[PDB]
Design a binder for this molecule. Structure first.
Ligand SMILES: O=S1(=O)CC[C@@H](O)C1
Ligand SMILES: O=S1(=O)CC[C@@H](O)C1
Ligand SMILES: O=S1(=O)CC[C@@H](O)C1
Ligand SMILES: O=S1(=O)CC[C@@H](O)C1
Ligand SMILES: [Zn+2]
Ligand SMILES: [Zn+2]
Lengths: 371, 371
């Protein structure tokens, strides 16, 4: 009988950890990369190694709507994915894509599709994520645009913490949700150490199944992101998963695991694949470049994915140049699989106590760009 | 103002001729190859060089039916092809695919699809081809299976000639058809010279816009087919087109033009393309063969088709091995275009009085198979 949510750390190296999250719909190996599910077939996404995928609540609210998804059987039935699904709260896309009114109560916003009015709040976000039936639920917070003044960073963080308690109570009010799903809280505080500590203390007092580091990957650059992670991750409870939302490039992931992060999500592998960019151990490549037109090697000569067992750079180049959808599908499958192989090498190297070496070896090769 | 049907011979070499057939829907360059239209887009088929395509009356009768096609605007609207269309009579597929009753009146047969009853005769065939709206109409004849006894060959040929007169009269009875389309008669007589002469005399007495050589390409082998063509084609009127039905391989076409044939049709380029076989100037190749997996040359290094300007053997090999429909589409486009380039080289070489040399050069290279 599988548990609701059980995080076990199997091995450590410095701040890095590797282990598992056991949930009713399956086991998640950590550090984990979650592709964004909101197209490749779900069996293809699973075969790349993904243990869990992410759904964007905001987009699902606008089309086809969470009530419709619930009537269809829930998000797992809707997406054809029967393993765990994490949903975000919707709040970030409200800031970035939609906004009629904002207050401590919640937000009202207009659909950028058809102009209809929608509402989000801690209580409404948790309820919508319940209708979607997701396994990991994100608390609803307030995002502050980058760069943020110290005043606005403190203001949004304190509101986010009040909203985190409201998210906690809303989640706990539904027995069907509280017994079967998990709830993560989100640390805020921009680049400010005292605000991050304030946030971490408040979240740990409320209590969550996992803790996200919010407010990064919004324009700040890698060096600054790493500096914030340096002091922010140790503030979170050690025995629970640490989730860096919206990150990121392969070298961002490696450096964040060095700093204690267990979970990641990013649209980058799928966006790059649609745009003709492949990730490789020698850095990203643009497959349209003429140098690939007669290159019989696969996208990456070490990649274990199904695409690289069969297709050459030359032939993917031909498909992409012709605008054939198969080209984009193959690139996208490869990129998601490459990300999963990166996570597997990270997990194995932590287990063997050679992750610090792997990270240095990885960077030297990825940035040399000898592709 | 384009004429109904005007055949002009521009140049000759021995028995070979090159010229044009002018019709209301366009000009047909001869010797001509007609792809079988009954999928690639019609604009793709046109871009390969085809001036006219063939429709199979029998298949169109069974699905969706000629009355339905007429209500949809005719076969040109149905197929998206606004240039000339030749239709066969349906009689060959009755023998080869369906057959309730046969007599001098006509035939009743059962649809191999749904068992429904259909009827063909000279009068019904011409009427159905009128409903289809085709530009070149084939007289309805009686096919004799191969090999045929002298008695059965004479019996089917004499009936075919009585049916050719009935086809002539049926065609002439519809002013809309007789003023806008053309009618071809079909010579029969198996391998027997006296029967072929009997047939040719009867057809010329009736009078037709063009004359087909029927009863070949049904198992007899090329040497025997060529021997029959040697005496049969000179029996037909010189100033009208000569049509060899259902032929054939590239070397069959070359040898038949040497013997006075102006028009051809065959499913071979499309069937081969779906089966992973490409025609080349060095003979056919099976693209699945391992030797092509890293071959960066196009299917044929002299072929002018759109496929060979872009796609390598290696990449078409990859698509075909994966079962991707694009692979079959590219092979089929190439094969139809290769056939049209063969016809163009035949036309140009006759015009220049070097066709006998082209035919010898063609055979030496095609049969050496240095691909
Ligand atoms: O990310 S997925 O597995 C592929 C598209 C949806 O079926 C969810
Ligand atoms: O079905 S929904 O997601 C909830 C009500 C609207 O915001 C659309
Ligand atoms: O042979 S065709 O041009 C292609 C399939 C039909 O549109 C007729
Ligand atoms: O519409 S049809 O081609 C003429 C009547 C049947 O043979 C089907
Ligand atoms: Zn790969
Ligand atoms: Zn070609």
């Amino acid at each position: 009988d599988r548990p609701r949510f059980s995080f076990s750390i199997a091995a450590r190296e410095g701040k890095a950890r590797t282990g598992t999250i056991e949930m009713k719909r399956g086991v998640i190996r950590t550090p984990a990369f979650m592709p964004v599910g909101t197209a490749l077939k779900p069996e293809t996404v699973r075969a790349t190694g993904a243990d869990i995928i992410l759904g964007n609540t905001y987009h699902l609210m606008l089309r086809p709507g969470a009530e419709r998804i619930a009537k269809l059987g829930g998000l797992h039935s809707f997406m054809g994915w029967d393993r765990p699904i994490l949903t975000d709260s919707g709040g970030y896309q409200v800031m970035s894509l939609s906004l009629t009114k904002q207050s401590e109560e919640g937000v009202t916003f207009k659909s950028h599709l058809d102009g209809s009015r929608h509402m989000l709040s801690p209580e409404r976000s948790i309820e919508i994520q319940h209708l979607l039936g997701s396994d990991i639920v994100m608390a609803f917070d307030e995002s502050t645009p980058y760069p943020a003044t110290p005043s606005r960073a403190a203001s949004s963080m304190e509101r986010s913490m009040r909203w985190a308690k409201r998210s906690r109570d809303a989640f706990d009010s539904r027995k069907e949700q509280a017994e079967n799903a998990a709830l993560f809280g989100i640390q805020q505080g921009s680049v400010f150490e005292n605000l991050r500590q304030q946030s971490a203390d408040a979240l740990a007092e409320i209590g969550f199944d996992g803790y996200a580091v919010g407010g990064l990957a919004v324009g700040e650059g890698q060096d600054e992101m790493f500096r914030v992670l340096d002091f922010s991750v140790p503030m979170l409870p050690d025995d629970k998963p640490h989730y860096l939302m919206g990150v990121g490039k392969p070298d961002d992931i490696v450096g964040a695991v060095e700093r204690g992060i267990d979970m990641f999500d990013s649209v980058l592998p799928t966006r790059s694949g649609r745009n003709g960019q492949a990730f490789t151990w020698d850095g990203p490549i643009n497959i349209r470049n003429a140098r690939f037109s007669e290159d019989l090697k696969p996208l990456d000569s070490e990649c274990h994915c199904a695409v690289c067992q069969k297709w050459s750079r030359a032939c993917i180049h031909a498909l992409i140049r012709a605008g054939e959808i198969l080209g984009a599908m193959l690139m996208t499958e490869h990129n998601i699989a490459f990300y999963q192989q990166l996570m597997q090498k990270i997990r194995d190297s932590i287990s063997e106590g050679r992750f610090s070496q792997f990270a240095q070896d990885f960077r030297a090769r990825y940035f040399a760009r000898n592709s």
